[PDB]
Amino acid sequence: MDIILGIRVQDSVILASSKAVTRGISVLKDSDDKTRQLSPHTLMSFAGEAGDTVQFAEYIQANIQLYSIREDYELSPQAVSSFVRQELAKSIRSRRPYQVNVLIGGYDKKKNKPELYQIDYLGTKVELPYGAHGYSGFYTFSLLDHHYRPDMTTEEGLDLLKLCVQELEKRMPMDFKGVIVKIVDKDGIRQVDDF
């Protein structure tokens, strides 16, 4: 429902997140950005229980930004993903767990490699070439399994992503009002305004 997708290509990570916010029988908003910049080369998209999603994302954002200031240094995507996983792993056995699923797209400047991490609300982390949360993967993974090549360009990745959104728009019961697409690479994070 909340659709969040992720594709790691040769030189970048692409995250696509649905714009709809629905409450009851009404679409309250159709331009919602379901992501937060954790650091200049690390982006986290999120989906799950209302309120928990944003509260969790911003809490993580604050912690990573605090680290950046303290050490005058950017944490690697792997390090950020491990921190995020631990927070969710703590959360699941709390009195009231964060019901939030996240994708973490980042570009490691030391390795010069893009990295995509999928973490569910239980604290289940996996590094993947492409990832999704919820029912989104049920439609798109067959397309990605087929067309996905590891040496693709950013433009080829966007075309592959378009193919996924088209399939979702065709077969998914709800209207998720399109997606906001963001690219993470060596030069940082930028948004594709026309999708």
């Binding site: 409450r23 029988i25 009404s26 309250l28 209302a50 309120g51 944003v54």
Partner: protein, 214 residues
């Protein structure tokens, strides 16, 4: 609970319009309820869901906003005010608070701003919001007639006409309409309008509601 509340951004600031009905089941407890909470002279809040929860915590919010400007010698942003409230209810999440409100304000750095704040922790910035049992009826009138370049006179009528639409169809909405116009220099009250008298008046002048004999 039963209500129709709306708020929308436009060229001349923000319009806030609400109904006045309170119901305990089928029993109509009140027709004179206040669903706009005057947080302070510059900030408004809407009541939908728990009446007490909205009253208590949006009054509490005004106290926090007053303390902010005493310490910082500056008007509080709508962003920060909405955040104080949403962070507060998020602490209480799961306990059973019931709240669906629009925190409305007009500042220099932001301009006219509306934040939908809700008891399960949601905090959304937006241009148009409608909340309550009659929200769908009000959305229809709003969406079809809304434009950014609306005049203050026409915008006030649109908000009034949208509540009337819901009051008519939604059984748990009605009584009277309370209008507000929010400007950078503060909000302005635009009166109480009985739906009984307002309906017949709009029917005649507009030509709408032909299904109703009058």
């Amino acid at each position: 609970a039963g209500a129709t509340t709306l708020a929308f951004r436009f060229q001349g600031g923000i319009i806030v319009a609400v109904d006045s009905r309170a119901t305990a089941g089928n029993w109509v407890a009140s027709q004179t309820v206040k669903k706009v909470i005057e947080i302070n002279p510059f900030l408004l809040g809407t009541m939908a869901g728990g009446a007490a929860d909205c009253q208590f915590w949006e009054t509490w919010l005004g106290s926090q906003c007053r303390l902010h400007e005493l310490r910082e010698k500056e008007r509080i942003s709508v962003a920060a005010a909405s955040r104080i409230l949403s962070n507060l209810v998020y602490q209480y999440k799961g306990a059973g608070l019931s709240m669906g409100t629009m925190i409305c304000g007009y500042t220099r750095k932001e301009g006219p701003t509306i934040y939908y704040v809700d008891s399960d922790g949601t905090r959304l910035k937006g241009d148009i919001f409608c909340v309550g049992s009659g929200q769908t009826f009000a959305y229809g009138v709003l969406d079809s007639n809304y434009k950014w370049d609306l005049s203050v006179e026409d915008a006030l009528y649109l908000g009034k006409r949208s509540i009337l639409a819901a009051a008519h169809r939604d059984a748990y909405s009605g009584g009277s309409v309370n209008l507000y116009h929010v400007t950078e220099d503060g909000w302005i009250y635009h009166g109480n309008h009985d739906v009984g008298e307002l309906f017949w008046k709009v029917k005649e002048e507009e030509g709408s509601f032909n299904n109703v004999i009058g």
